[PDB]
Ligand binder design. Structure first.
Ligand SMILES: N#Cc1cc(Cl)c(C(=O)Nc2ccnc(NC(=O)C3CC3)c2)c(Cl)c1
Length: 289
């Protein structure tokens, strides 16, 4: 699929991803205004070869993924000004849950349905031999009150069939407050590491993405702000001591125990995304009416 820059009409900026900005565009070749709304993710024109290779990877991965709980790849547009490809994705009407939840009081059963859907999209992603490496409520988009879609794949990587992990490197933009201890210490990302991040994402939905209850806030309240280059080391240590994010207000005790099970120090003790699907289907059924 191909898109033409001449027919793209900018509405407003949607935000910042891993490898650039996301903008709301009205693709209208008829010139009336009835054209379909598209989310266009662009690579910054000033980025070096280290990001240009990572951006091409993001497009390639999203183009090969097809699932109801994963943002749809619409096509590619030739960016004449940046000499790269502009990622054309579907416009998810309600946006990210990080922006949606603090302003819209969403029921317990409804949030449980979202987590179930995240697990469904994540199980497919793992079946296609890919790790997300950036699972957070910030990267979970809402299409309607009963439908959720996984957003950005800037940090997503292909796990080669022979191995169960992918070796990561030192980076300042790493979502460390959503990362398992094995990613922070041994620099290894397993399929179980995405399950740890889901547990954190589930914690966010249950707090209604309240920034004062957010993972960086709660962990920095424990670590402190005057720890030099040892913020991640102090994070690794508290996670080893068995310290975890607190139970959100009105969150059921059994749901918090599922969270803690996604937060097992040992990667092998953590449930897979396939194990979580029938479990969340039942928990959602219990809390619905
Ligand atoms: N960090 C980060 C981060 C993560 C993601 Cl996944 C996005 C993103 O792609 N958001 C999208 C995509 C498509 N439609 C909408 N929809 C809306 O924004 C509607 C409210 C208007 C939002 C952004 Cl911008 C920043």
């Amino acid at each position: 699929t191909v898109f033409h820059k001449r027919y793209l009409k900018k509405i407003r900026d949607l935000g910042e991803g891993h490898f650039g900005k996301v903008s709301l565009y009205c693709y209208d070749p008829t010139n009336d205004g009835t054209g379909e709304m598209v989310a266009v993710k662009a690579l910054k024109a000033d980025a070096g070869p280290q990001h240009r290779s990572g951006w091409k990877q993001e497009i390639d991965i999203l183009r090969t993924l097809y699932h109801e709980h994963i943002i749809k790849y619409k096509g590619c547009c030739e960016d004449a000004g940046a000499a790269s490809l502009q990622l054309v994705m579907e416009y998810v009407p309600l946006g990210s849950l990080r922006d949606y939840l603090p302003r819209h009081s969403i029921g317990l059963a409804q949030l449980l349905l979202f987590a179930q859907q995240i697990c469904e999209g994540m199980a497919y992603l793992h079946a296609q031999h890919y790790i997300h490496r950036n699972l957070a409520a910030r990267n979970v988009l809402l299409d309607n009150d009963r439908l959720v879609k996984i957003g950005d794949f800037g940090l997503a990587k292909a796990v080669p069939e022979g191995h169960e992990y992918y070796r990561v490197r030192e980076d300042g933009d790493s979502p460390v407050f959503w990362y398992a201890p094995e990613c922070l210490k041994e620099y290894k990302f397993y399929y179980a590491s995405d399950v740890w991040s889901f547990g954190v994402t589930l914690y966010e939905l249950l707090t209604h993405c309240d920034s004062s209850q957010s993972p960086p806030t709660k962990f920095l309240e424990l670590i402190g702000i005057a720890q030099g280059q040892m913020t991640v080391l102090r994070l690794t240590e508290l996670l080893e001591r068995g310290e975890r994010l607190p139970r959100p207000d009105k969150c059921p005790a059994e749901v918090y125990h599922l969270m803690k099970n996604c937060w097992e120090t040992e990667a092998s003790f953590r449930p897979t995304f396939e194990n979580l699907i029938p479990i969340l289907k039942t928990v959602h059924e219990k809390y619905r009416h």
